[PDB]
Design an enzyme around this catalytic site. Structure first.
Site, PDB file in Angstrom:
ATOM      1  N   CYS A 102       0.070   4.113   2.546  1.00 37.56           N
ATOM      2  CA  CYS A 102       0.526   3.711   3.743  1.00 37.56           C
ATOM      3  C   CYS A 102       1.961   4.203   4.281  1.00 37.56           C
ATOM      4  CB  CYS A 102       0.151   2.191   4.160  1.00 37.56           C
ATOM      5  SG  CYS A 102      -1.297   1.504   3.769  1.00 37.56           S
ATOM      6  N   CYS A 109       0.964  -1.279   0.124  1.00 36.89           N
ATOM      7  CA  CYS A 109      -0.067  -0.073   0.051  1.00 36.89           C
ATOM      8  C   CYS A 109       1.014   1.286  -0.037  1.00 36.89           C
ATOM      9  CB  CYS A 109      -0.947  -0.136   1.296  1.00 36.89           C
ATOM     10  SG  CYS A 109      -1.541   1.618   1.535  1.00 36.89           S
TER      11      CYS A 109
END
Length: 107
Positions: free
Chosen positions: A34, A31
């Site tokens: 993230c 991700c």
């Protein structure tokens, strides 16, 4: 640093039975967003050390927690206050954005 790494098995002890607010961040390596909000969690962690504990939960190593709280995607931020969810934040964000979210939800 002051950040607590979580697991499905320690989530109860570390988050629910805690006293004081805890901001849980569900993340994973694949991700991108993230990874960008990660260094931000580092800053907040030391700056709010004392009023808030910052905790990370890697959903690849712990696939069981996210579904318990209806978390569809990441990044996702859940702010707890002694065993319960107080506020939720989804998607990429900035330090300012997170600080405003914290000023509006912390005592």
């Amino acid at each position: 640093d002051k950040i607590i790494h979580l697991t499905d098995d320690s989530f109860d002890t570390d988050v629910l039975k805690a006293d004081g607010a805890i901001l849980v961040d569900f993340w994973a390596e694949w991700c991108g967003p993230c990874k960008m909000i990660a260094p931000i969690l580092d800053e907040i962690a030391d700056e709010y050390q004392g009023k808030l504990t910052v905790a990370k939960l890697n959903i690849d190593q712990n696939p069981g927690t996210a579904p318990k709280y209806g978390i569809r995607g990441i990044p996702t931020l859940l702010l707890f206050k002694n065993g319960e969810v107080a506020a939720t934040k989804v998607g990429a964000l900035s330090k300012g954005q997170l600080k405003c979210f914290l000023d509006a939800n912390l005592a």
